Design a binder for this molecule. Sequence first.
Ligand SMILES: [Cl-]
Length: 63
Amino acid sequence: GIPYRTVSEWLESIRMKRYILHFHSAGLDTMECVLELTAEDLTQMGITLPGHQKRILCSIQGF
Ligand SMILES: [Cl-]
């Protein structure tokens, strides 16, 4: 990939679309915006549950 074309498609595929507003209000609206995200970025974004951070960060590493 990137094997996803939209942030929304990517999040849905990893079952984290519950965090879609968190990504948009932090101005991350394309796949290229997310490639270098860290657990610190997620926390600051309000995504703090560790298994969810892991789900998201593992997915990006898997691209
Ligand atoms: Cl993109």
